[PDB]
């Protein structure tokens, strides 16, 4: 609410980090390396962004990423297609979303219906090389399925602010070279903190 | 030109990384740590971004950052104030720019008039804690003065894609905890690469 923008901003930061590998590049530079070929990245302009959850945060991510020329599609069981259309997000059924996306971000509560929203079965329906962001709640993305998808290349990268357990006891995702992460920083701004 | 968007995207990446310390945070996570308090960040909405150089890349950065609610001001010796106004950048003389900015980004060629455009003198005229980006040409920002500004806290952070020497032989900037960096990745996208 106060914190809608802090979360939305982080999410968009994570999207740009996935496209360009800024965290990995910084660590390479700090280790004395100059690795130009390794961190060849991708332009966001023209790419499809799937937004799952079209409440305040989802809407704010949408309008920021639209300024980059991203095509913004999404799903929400509750928000009307008229409302989402008013902020430029084309709503489609989930099964239609998966194959279209270059990026996917999640902006849902953690409910039975949203736990492992992204799992083995939904990763299989994505475009190969999809990139995924979870700055919402840990568990929305099944962590085992994400690791399997990163191992195969089915997922090319992921940005995680939240984890099923916090801090995560299993370090395989954090340790993966194509994973960027923060210690649940989504509301951690000076501004969000004072209403 | 092809590559205007690749550069502009990287610059906006670096702005978001400075606000939220995403590269540092990822390193912290990869080192096994969960340091939430340490990486308290800042919201971009409502902040002032100064854009020095209002050509194609500067413009594109402007319109993207404007979607985050940033106030975009700037300076260019060639572009008229009515023209910059038409893409939402308020032009002011340089001396007026320094004290207003929360973030500064440079988008100039490397000329005598732009080498060390940011130096000891212009850092002193900035707001304490200014954050700086150079995704343009190495040397626009005086590297020595930038280090001194980071050491004093006058500059709270910097993001560098380019260096006076590449790879940089002097490692003090790169190694600083508030500096994020890439190995000259501004045009390093699959898309920019094929015209
Ligand atoms: C109850 N509920 N469910 C969602 C949802 C679930 C799956 C995908 C997108 C959105 C959002 C809310 N508030
Ligand atoms: C020739 N020139 N000079 C600049 C400049 C100079 C000082 C400050 C900001 C921008 C940009 C271009 N194209």
Numbering used by the authors:
A (entry chain B), B (entry chain A): 100 to 294
Paper text:
Human 3-phosphoglycerate dehydrogenase (PHGDH) is responsible for the NAD+-dependent conversion of 3-phosphoglycerate (3-PG) to phosphohydroxypyruvate (PHP), which is the first step in the de novo serine synthesis pathway. Thus PHGDH-93 provides a valuable tool to investigate binders to the cofactor-binding site.
PHGDH-93 was then successfully crystallised with an empty, accessible cofactor-binding pocket. Analysis of the fragments’ binding modes showed that four of the fragments (5, 14, 15 and 16) were coordinated by hydrogen and/or halogen bonds, whereas the other three fragments (3, 9 and 10) appeared to be stabilised only by apolar contacts. The remaining two crystallographically observed fragments, 3 (1-methyl-3-phenyl-1H-pyrazol-5-amine) and 10 (3-(1,3-oxazol-5-yl)aniline) were non-fused bicyclic aromatic systems, which, although not forming specific hydrogen bonds to the protein, bound in a similar orientation to one another to the adenine pocket (3, Kd = 5.8 ± 2.0 mM and 10, Kd = 9.3 ± 3.8 mM).
